[PDB]
Amino acid sequence: YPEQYNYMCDIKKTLDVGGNSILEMPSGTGKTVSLLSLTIAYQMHYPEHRKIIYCSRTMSEIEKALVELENLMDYRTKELGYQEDFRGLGLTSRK
């Protein structure tokens, strides 16, 4: 979408310049917008440079970030056909 590329161009300009950015997103339309831009900014730089650190507020947003990362890896293994160095860790509760 073109509206998702507006926040993605701001995420590609603040991750390589600013140190902290208060970016507002609409509800139900900004989950995978910053998800793909975080793996693209690392692919534009170095893939073993700065890794992604996600800080949710609930355990559901931890679980919802894992299935979107599977869609990011499925879009990188079907549109490219190459299996790179995988990542992603589900740091949940102890019980």
Partner 1 sequence: MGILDEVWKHKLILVETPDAQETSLALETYRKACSNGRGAILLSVARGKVSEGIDFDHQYGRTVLMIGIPFQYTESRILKARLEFMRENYRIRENDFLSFDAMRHAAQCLGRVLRGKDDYGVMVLADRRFSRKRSQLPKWIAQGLSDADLNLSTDMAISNTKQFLRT
Extract the annotated binding site for ATP: 25-32
Contacting residues toward partner 1, per CB under 8 A: 26-29, 57-58, 60-61, 64
CB of 29 to partner 1, least distance (A): 6
Cβ closest to partner 1, residue 27 vs residue 83: 27
Q: The tokens 């490219």 sit on which residue?
A: 80
Q: What is the DSSP letter of 14?
A: H
Cβ closest to partner 1, residue 17 vs residue 55: 55
Cα-based distances in Å from 95 to 29, 35, 91, 92: 32, 28, 12, 9
Q: Give Cβ neighbours of residue 84 (< 8 Å, ≥ 6 apart).
A: 47, 76
CB of 92 to partner 1, least distance (A): 15
- Point out the annotated binding site: 25-32
